[PDB]
């Protein structure tokens, strides 16, 4: 669900 660092990369 965490594709990267930051809020913008949460599915």
């Amino acid at each position, epitope marked *: *669900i*965490h594709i*990267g*660092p*930051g*809020r*913008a*990369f*949460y599915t």
Partner: antibody
Amino acid sequence: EVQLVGSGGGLIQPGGSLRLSCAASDFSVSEYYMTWVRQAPGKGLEWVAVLYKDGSQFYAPSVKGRFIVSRDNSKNSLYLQMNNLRGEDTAVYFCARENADYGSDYYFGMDVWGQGTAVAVSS
Amino acid sequence: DIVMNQSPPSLAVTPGEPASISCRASQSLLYSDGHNYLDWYLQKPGQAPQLLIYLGSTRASGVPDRFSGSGSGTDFTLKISRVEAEDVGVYYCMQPLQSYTFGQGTKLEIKR
């Protein structure tokens, strides 16, 4: 009192490795997103690494593949393993508790920071 | 690759006067969740950064009334209504949306 106290660090020759520690108080390091932010001498704030409760890890491009964020559920500590150190790394390292869970909606900023421990890469 | 631009680098203020620091993002720190993801931090000399305002406009637990954050989209403003001698330090803005990036910082000085 809720706080982060970090330690380790000091002088370390170029190429060498070094582990920064940081220990929580009155909260579990396994229960919050945690971040490592550094600050080069005179220069400003640079983010370095984040470790999500949701297992995962991601790094600033400048360091990726040299640093590692680990926690210890029993020692209640956050760790920053720093490998193959360039002078570009000498700075003050702050661990910080990002009081947020993107799972739910909530977010509350970098809630808690450590006093900051200094690293000096040098011959 | 979100970039923040802080204005000004420095500003002097007399205690009692208002101050106002600006942060300007490369993209919109407005997220589809209906929130503004930008923070404001104070770094008093030789200390760790302390949080002032999260979610663009919400003051943290303990922060004085005098601090207020406004803005939306890509332009933002931290405002101190009445500066005190102890508000001296460096103010940084950070976005936690795409990676984690900080403004260049803003040195607040007191006039006396």
